[PDB]
């Protein structure tokens, strides 16, 4: 696949970024600092597996192996850590910029070619499977080296060199009272409005993002058989996985090192250490308990080899949609072991969509596991406005209950109500209709777990408030309806019966 990712961030040392046209507004230096801390913590929450670095230039001091002047690296390409967050945090604020100007140089001339060279060098200094390129920059000046046209020439030459070596750059607008005026030196050396302002994609960086976004990984490599010998390469995925809190990392009291776990069984009467062979599975049914060993217990659990065998075809309407047992799975055709299976997949999906019939198929996920009966639900490929898929093509995996899985229900009868009341809450729902969207409902409880986690990690002054969305805005609905609720209470309920006991 695509392995680790690298994101590199560049900010010039000059007094322009320490100053603003309006002192109420942030300095470019300070807003860049707070934005980079925000994206660092967002990445730590989201996809901490990748690699990040911090480097500065234009200072009165330099830190790099190449010893290019005023070129000062701060954090090399590493997975982000809380120490990095705090050591970039103290430099925020007015006092932060003051102490930065004190202990760190600020404001000098340099070359873009040399900073490009050293950043490419430190990118090369990583021995990990690289996935993508992201070398951010932050400047309010579009012509930093137009004084020497040779410097511009070598800068665009080195930009061509990076784009030849599979490196990709990106530019961030910074506020300019005279307008940043892109295309003066860019859109040709890099890969619209003059942008007096700066917010072009920083607003997407400032918003808090909390997820895990598991990368592209096959759930299981599976081989499908129709009757006895039709071999098909199929790949199973899931569009949804239950998100859980990360496991606690058990560790020592004082030193807080992670203590290893030792588990053992020993005799009581003898007192000596037991052995794994002596362990026997035991259950007590009736008077005579049952003596057993584990290996034959999973052998009894072992029924059939993994595979999907077609058990027939049933129209999609015959199944009752309320029958679910698990988050639905999704299969995709494969051509790894079997060649031409995708042609079969296309033909069968076309024919089944024409005939709107499900495909019942016995399911065996893993060896020595009980088999199961699943029906194949076809799914089309739906594009968005920009022709980007929103509904993936392929087949959904629905799970049908057994006889025992259907819990018995207490007897319930059919009771009718006046159609006047029916129209009444038809009006009620029409008052409060909206459209569901899947990208607006998170688990704020996990969000608060994380919130407390960075609050303790970075010693944040307050436990960050979880912006819950599960609570209804009851006042709004009550305002919208008002005198209709008591109308329902009089229409249906007797005017002496409280809903409580």
């Amino acid at each position: 696949y695509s392995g680790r990712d690298s994101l590199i961030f560049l900010v010039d040392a000059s007094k322009a970024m320490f100053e603003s046209q309006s002192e109420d507004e942030l300095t470019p230096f300070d807003m860049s600092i707070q934005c980079i801390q925000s994206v660092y913590i967002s990445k730590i929450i989201s996809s901490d597996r990748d690699l990040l670095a911090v480097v500065f230039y234009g200072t009165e001091k330099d830190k790099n192996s190449v010893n290019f002047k005023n070129i000062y690296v701060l954090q090399e390409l590493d997975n982000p850590g809380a120490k990095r967050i705090l050591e970039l945090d103290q430099f925020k604020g007015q006092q932060g910029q003051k102490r930065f100007q004190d202990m760190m140089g600020h404001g000098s001339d340099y070359s873009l070619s040399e900073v490009l060279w050293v950043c490419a060098n430190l990118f090369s200094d990583v021995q990990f499977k690289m996935s993508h390129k992201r070398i951010m920059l932050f400047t309010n000046e579009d012509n930093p080296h137009g004084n020497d046209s040779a410097k511009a020439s070598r800068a665009r030459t080195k930009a061509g060199d990076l784009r030849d070596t599979g490196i990709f750059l990106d530019l961030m607008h910074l506020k300019k009272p005279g307008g940043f005026d892109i295309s003066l030196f860019y859109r040709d050396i890099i890969s619209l409005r003059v942008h007096f302002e700066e917010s072009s994609k920083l607003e997407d960086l400032l918003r808090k993002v909390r997820a895990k976004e598991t990368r592209k990984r096959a759930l299981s490599r599976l081989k499908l058989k129709l009757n006895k010998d039709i071999v098909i390469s199929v790949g199973i995925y899931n569009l949804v996985q239950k998100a859980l809190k990360p496991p606690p990392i058990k560790l020592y009291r004082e030193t807080n090192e992670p203590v290893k776990t030792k588990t053992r069984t020993f005799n009581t009467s003898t007192g000596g250490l037991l052995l794994p062979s002596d362990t026997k599975r035991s259950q007590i049914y009736g008077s005579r308990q049952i003596i057993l060993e584990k290996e034959e217990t999973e052998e009894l659990k072992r029924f059939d080899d993994p595979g999907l065998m077609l058990m027939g075809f049933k129209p999609l309407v015959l199944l009752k949609k309320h029958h679910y047992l698990r988050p639905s799975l999704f299969v995709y055709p494969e051509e790894s072991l079997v060649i031409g299976s995708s042609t079969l997949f296309s033909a069968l999906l076309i024919k089944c969509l024409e005939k709107e019939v499900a495909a019942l198929c016995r399911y065996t996920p893993r060896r020595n596991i009980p088999p199961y009966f699943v029906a194949l639900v076809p799914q089309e490929e739906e594009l968005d406005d920009q022709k980007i898929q929103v509904t993936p093509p392929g087949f959904q995996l629905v799970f049908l209950p057994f006889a025992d899985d259907k819990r018995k229900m207490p007897f319930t009868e059919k009771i009718m109500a006046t159609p006047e009341q029916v129209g009444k809450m038809k009006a009620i729902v029409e008052k409060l209709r909206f459209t569901y969207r899947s990208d607006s409902f998170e688990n704020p409880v996990l969000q608060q777990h994380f919130r407390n986690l960075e609050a303790l990690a970075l010693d944040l002054m307050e436990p960050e408030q979880a912006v819950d969305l599960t609570l209804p805005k009851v006042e709004a609905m009550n305002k919208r309806l008002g005198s209709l609720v008591d109308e329902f209470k009089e229409l249906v309920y007797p005017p002496d019966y409280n809903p409580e006991g």
Binding site: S2, S131, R437
Partner: peptide
Amino acid sequence: CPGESLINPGFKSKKPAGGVDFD
């Protein structure tokens, strides 16, 4: 690329959770 996570290559951009907007 527009419509993709600028913070995450190979992933789409996600709009912040909004909740509800009744009609």
